[PDB]
Design a protein around this ligand. Structure first.
Ligand SMILES: Cn1cc(NC(=O)c2cnn3ccc(N[C@@H]4CCCC[C@@H]4N)nc23)c(C(F)(F)F)n1
Length: 292
């Protein structure tokens, strides 16, 4: 797959000169991460998401360029209904830009937090999102790709709340070790925090996502006990609590049987030993069985 090459000035123009104000006040900024800001745009008779890369954290200009290239490379090779669609990019201008099909319902992270007053996701919608995201990860793993940044902020939701895996800047082709440890701490497997590069780490991070789906709680909350959501697995196992005590109250269609079935998948994904975790095909099978 080869992409459209956009002019920097066309992208600057359709995003109201990269307006960093929220949508609600007439701005174009929809969200931001460590490697960039995503703006709403309208190009070639289509609402788009324009990601302008900028860091914002570490970051070598070459590192950011390597993430820009990595994202285009993964998107050229990987097209799936549970992955975001890249339309094009921009290099000619000062800032590096990535153009995608606009995701009207933004990120799973924001929908779980009901950011800006959006209604809570039903359990029925949550099951479809979990299945869809697992189908997207399966496609990446089948195509020998390791995401390395699986999190609710990197699971986007379309006009039908279909799960779309996004933000492949840190993705790697396929156990190897790295001197540059990258990812989101609260979601990272212990071996990934140590430098290991394995698809087994993506499974662990997906386990954290499944806990966010069941509970509606963020992966990390400094003003909460436990601060890290993954610690709930031990509180439940050590029988101090049950998964029912953690179920998101912002749902009226969640039955205990299917919630326990999703929790069982999350628990298995969150095994501290990488080799004891299920592979993505097993995760898919179990999530499909959950709604059958
Ligand atoms: C209403 N709304 C629409 C979007 N996003 C897109 O439409 C979009 C489409 N493809 N695509 C690809 C990457 C990407 N990355 C962002 C980066 C900031 C942190 C969140 C994401 N991981 N966003 C997108 C957003 C939000 F994600 F920024 F929150 N809100």
């Amino acid at each position: 797959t080869r992409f459209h090459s956009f002019s920097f000035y066309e992208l600057k123009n359709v995003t109201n000169n990269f307006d960093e104000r929220p949508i609600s006040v007439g701005g174009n900024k929809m969200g931001e991460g460590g490697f960039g800001v995503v703006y709403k745009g309208y190009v070639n008779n289509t609402t788009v998401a324009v990601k302008k890369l900028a860091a914002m954290v570490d970051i070598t200009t070459e590192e950011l360029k390597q993430q820009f290239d990595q994202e285009i490379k993964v998107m050229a090779k990987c097209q799936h209904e549970n992955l975001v669609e890249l339309l094009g990019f921009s290099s000619d201008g000062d800032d590096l830009c990535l153009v995608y099909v606009y995701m009207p319902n933004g990120s799973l992270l924001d929908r779980l937090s009901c950011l800006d007053g959006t209604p809570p996701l039903s359990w029925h919608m949550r099951c479809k999102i979990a299945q869809g995201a697992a189908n997207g990860i399966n496609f990446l793993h089948e195509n020998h790709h390791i995401h390395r940044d699986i999190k609710s902020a990197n699971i986007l939701l379309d006009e039908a709340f279909t799960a779309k895996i996004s933000d492949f800047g840190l993705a790697r082709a396929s156990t190897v070790m790295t001197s540059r440890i990258v990812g989101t701490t609260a979601y990272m497997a212990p071996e990934a925090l140590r430098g290991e590069i394995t698809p087994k780490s993506d499974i662990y991070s997906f386990g954290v996502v499944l806990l966010e789906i069941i509970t509606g709680l963020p992966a990390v909350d400094e003003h909460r006990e436990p601060q890290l959501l993954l610690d709930i697995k031990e509180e439940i196992e050590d029988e101090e609590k049950t998964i029912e005590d953690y179920i998101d109250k912002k749902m009226n269609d969640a039955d205990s049987t299917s919630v326990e079935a999703m929790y069982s998948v999350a628990s298995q994904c969150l095994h501290e030993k990488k080799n004891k975790r299920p592979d993505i095909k097993k995760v898919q099978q179990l999530l499909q069985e959950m709604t059958a």
